[PDB]
Write a protein that binds this ligand. Structure first.
Ligand SMILES: CC(=O)N[C@H]1[C@@H](OP(=O)(O)OP(=O)(O)OC[C@H]2O[C@@H](n3ccc(=O)[nH]c3=O)[C@H](O)[C@@H]2O)O[C@H](CO)[C@@H](O)[C@@H]1O[C@H](C)C(=O)O
Length: 242
């Protein structure tokens, strides 16, 4: 359907999906399954798209949408209501609870342990990726990273992700080896976000890494892209214990 199913050795206890722009009600340039409430779309259309998502994904409960600020804070999903959802990642060990990260070029990373008793979702735009959102998400697991699986969701691929030296400086400041992921391209660099994610995951001992095959910018029939469209919708990536 509209939904991507992660190609990873997913535990029996785990369910996951990642939305596309297909199968909603929003008009261009939000066309059609826009899940974003802060990008200037009709709030009634977004509401209806979030309902279509809930049904298409057979989610057991409403996704816990975060107040994403492109940082490295993780929200442990211990039960609604929540005082503050100011975070760029969520962690769950609670059956039926849905971790959700909202993107349109930023890397969504979905995580679970081999046992299929812990899950998480992280929003890794370059700012949060650089800051350590993936490392902070992995550090919320009780299980050792050797037993953690990660799935690199649809993000802006290295064909498309032109950045200035400012972004390269920021990553190399934290871990010089990030240099490998930035390739000179005119007066700017092409950044490999999947490569930077693989670096950070390896840094905390996550070795079992899947996905990384998509490009939100290039695959315009399937994804919104902030870089491509500027005014556009948002996809989201979801994981839960069944
Ligand atoms: C992290 C990521 O993939 N994208 C995020 C990033 O956009 P980005 O597109 O990178 O914009 P920039 O940060 O302003 O710029 C980052 C670097 O890239 C250079 N550049 C930018 C645009 C261009 O055409 N050419 C070019 O070279 C610029 O000069 C700087 O060095 O920042 C936006 C807020 O400003 C976020 O909304 C967006 O998140 C999305 C929605 C999401 O959460 O899914």
């Amino acid at each position: 359907s509209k939904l991507i199913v992660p190609q990873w050795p997913q535990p029996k206890g785990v369910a996951a999906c990642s939305s596309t722009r297909i199968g909603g009600v929003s008009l261009p340039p939000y066309d059609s399954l826009n899940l974003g409430a802060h990008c200037g779309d009709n709030p009634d259309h977004v509401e209806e798209n979030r309902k279509r998502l809930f049904a298409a994904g057979n989610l057991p409960s409403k996704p816990v949408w975060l107040e994403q600020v492109h940082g490295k804070d993780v929200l442990k999903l211990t039960g609604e209501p929540y005082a503050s959802k100011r975070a760029d990642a969520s962690y769950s060990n609670t059956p039926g609870t849905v971790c959700a990260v909202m993107t349109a070029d930023a890397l969504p990373v979905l995580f679970c342990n081999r046992a299929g008793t812990e899950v998480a979702a992280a929003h890794a735009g370059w700012r949060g990726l650089c800051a350590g959102v993936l490392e902070e998400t992995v550090s919320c697991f009780a299980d050792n990273p050797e037993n953690i699986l990660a799935w690199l969701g649809p993000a802006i691929g290295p064909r498309a992700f032109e950045v200035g030296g400012e972004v390269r400086e920021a990553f190399m400041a934290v871990d010089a080896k990030a240099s490998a992921a930035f390739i000179q391209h005119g007066d700017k660099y092409l950044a490999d976000i999947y490569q930077l994610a693989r670096q950070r995951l390896a840094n905390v001992g996550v070795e079992q890494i899947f996905g990384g095959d998509r490009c939100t910018y290039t695959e315009n029939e399937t994804f919104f892209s902030y870089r491509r469209d500027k005014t556009t919708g948002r996809m989201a990536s979801f994981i839960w214990l069944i």
